[PDB]
Amino acid sequence: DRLDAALRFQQEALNLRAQRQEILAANIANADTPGYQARDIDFASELKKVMVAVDLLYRVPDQPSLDGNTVDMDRERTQFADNSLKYQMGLTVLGSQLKGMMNVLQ
Amino acid sequence: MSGVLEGSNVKPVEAMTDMIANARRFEMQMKVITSVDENEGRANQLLSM
C-alpha cells in the first residue's frame, strides 16, 4: 500500500488534469451556444481535497455578450495549452518514477 | 386654396450625403470583419500542440 500511495499522489494529479482537460474541451465545443456559462475547477484545492465528487465553478466573464454566452476564447485556449503541458509533465514524472522503481529489481 | 396640388418633400442633397455615408460606413465595417476573422484564424493555431 506504500507503493499505492506513493504513486497515488501523481495518479490523482493526472486524473484531475484529465478532468480539467475534459471540461475545457466541453466549453470549447459549446463556445457558440447562447445562454451558456463557462465552467472550470480549482486544481490546487481540488487536489488537496482528493488527497485528504468534483465541484466546478463559473469562470468570471471578461466582456458582455447579448446572446448570453460568457465563455471567452483566448483565456480558455491558453488554459487548454497549459493544462496539456502540465498533463504531459505529470505523465513523464510518473513514468520516470515507475521506471526508477522497476530498474532496481533488475 | 384650390387649383394647386402639393408634391413631395425629399431633399436630394440629404439623400446623396446619406448614401455616401452609408457606403463608406459599410466599407469600414467590412474591413473590420476581415481583420477580426484573420486574427481569429491565425490565433486558433495556438490551440495545436
Swiss-Prot record, chain A:
InterPro entries: Flag_bb_rod_N (IPR001444), Flagellar_basal_body_rod_CS (IPR019776), FlgB (IPR006300). GO terms for cellular component: bacterial-type flagellum basal body, rod. It comes from the Bacteria. Its main location: other. Pfam families: Flg_bb_rod. It is found in: Bacterial flagellum basal body. Keywords: Bacterial flagellum. One of its GO terms (biological process) is bacterial-type flagellum-dependent cell motility. Disruption phenotype: Defects in flagellar assembly process. The keyword Methyltransferase does not apply. Signal peptide: none annotated. The basal body constitutes a major portion of the flagellar organelle and consists of a number of rings mounted on a central rod. In Gram-negative bacteria, at least four rings, L, P, S and M are present, whereas Gram-positive bacteria lack the L and P rings. The rod consists of about 26 subunits of FlgG in the distal portion, and FlgB, FlgC and FlgF build up the proximal portion of the rod with about 6 subunits each. Structural component of flagellum, the bacterial motility apparatus. Part of the rod structure of flagellar basal body. Belongs to the flagella basal body rod proteins family. This is Flagellar basal body rod protein FlgB. It comes from Salmonella typhimurium (strain LT2 / SGSC1412 / ATCC 700720). The lineage of its organism: Bacteria, Pseudomonadati, Pseudomonadota, Gammaproteobacteria, Enterobacterales.
Curated annotation (Swiss-Prot), chain B:
It comes from the Bacteria. It is found in: Bacterial flagellum basal body. Transmembrane segments: none annotated. The basal body constitutes a major portion of the flagellar organelle and consists of five rings (E,L,P,S, and M) mounted on a central rod. The rod consists of about 26 subunits of FlgG in the distal portion, and FlgB, FlgC and FlgF are thought to build up the proximal portion of the rod with about 6 subunits each. Belongs to the flagella basal body rod proteins family. This is Flagellar basal-body rod protein FlgF. It comes from Salmonella typhimurium (strain LT2 / SGSC1412 / ATCC 700720). The chain holds residues 202 to 250 of 251 of the full protein.
